[PDB]
Write a protein that binds this ligand. Sequence first.
Ligand SMILES: CNc1ncccn1
Ligand SMILES: [Cl-]
Ligand SMILES: [Mg+2]
Ligand SMILES: [Mg+2]
Ligand SMILES: [Mg+2]
Ligand SMILES: [Mg+2]
Lengths: 194, 194
Amino acid sequence: KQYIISEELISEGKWVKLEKTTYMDPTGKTRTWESVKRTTRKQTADGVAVIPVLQRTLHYECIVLVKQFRPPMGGYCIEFPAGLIDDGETPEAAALRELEEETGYKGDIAECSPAVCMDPGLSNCTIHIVTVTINGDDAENARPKPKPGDGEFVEVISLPKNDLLQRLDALVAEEHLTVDARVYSYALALKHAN
Amino acid sequence: KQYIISEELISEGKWVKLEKTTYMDPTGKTRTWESVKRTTRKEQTADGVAVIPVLQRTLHYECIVLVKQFRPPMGGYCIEFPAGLIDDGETPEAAALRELEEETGYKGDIAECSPAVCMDPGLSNCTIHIVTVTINGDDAENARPKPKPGDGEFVEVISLPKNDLLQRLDALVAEEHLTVDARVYSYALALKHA
Ligand SMILES: CNc1ncccn1
Ligand SMILES: [Cl-]
Ligand SMILES: [Mg+2]
Ligand SMILES: [Mg+2]
Ligand SMILES: [Mg+2]
Ligand SMILES: [Mg+2]
């Protein structure tokens, strides 16, 4: 019933462009929308986010998170490890790669979502969410070696899964970080379960 | 260590603007970024709210209430938590309850309210509060509820058992061409992973 009529470029950077979308509303009336897209999509999705489940025996199961300065935010954010999927990379491989570069952990794929939207009232950005377990007891994850890209500077934060939401709230109150919305959602559902 | 040096307006619509962001990296080097912001954000603590609406009824499994809308930036229909921007001088809780009733017809009761969390912090500064709300589906007010949506709003309500959220979302992805929001998918995965 609704669909896109045309997309007018307003402005195009190296990474991000702004368009004005014309669309047919369900009443038969033409309407416009200001839309953001990345200029880098190729790929099933722009990116991947990894839910990394750090499993070490006789320890609480942890969820591995990253903290970075996010220039659009103008401060530091706590997020699942993530990046853009390389041209002709699979989502699963972007996930393991990004997870390694950002945290140094070597993990195994548990499952992989379809492409899901990040902020669909604003942008077309999508990601695959990739659940990955990390055998914290293998020698390769003993002193995990984070190999960041150029211009990435990432702190690694492992929080117990069974207390994640309370832990995140503690971090925000005590540290002025912003928690990612997907991370916060995950944490909520851990509490809302059962 | 890192911080914003300056912010240069590249392009401004009625709703979104693109900015060139200059910042100090942790080595001491000046770098730039292409940042998106909304033009609508006054003194609200976040741009918007997303509502996690738990529909509770005697001798029913709990249901998560979701909305399906056409999203111009995506060129298609998306399944998402009920959500809208926070009006000037409105609290996140009021906005959450208002949007939920507007988009679904349900009158909920506040349960909890997150801090401001970031939507896509590598791309935008956009933030929401995620507001958890319980819906007493035994109250007569919530029996045959009508969405009273705004101008340009055309929303379908979809209620899914919390206990089978992830598969029910998958079954919808398999049946039509549509995208699940990443916050919704994160929540559904954590329900599974608990
Ligand atoms: C974020 N873009 C937007 N918002 C409202 C109406 C039109 N475009
Ligand atoms: Cl798992
Ligand atoms: Mg990254
Ligand atoms: Mg990286
Ligand atoms: Mg809305
Ligand atoms: Mg609305």
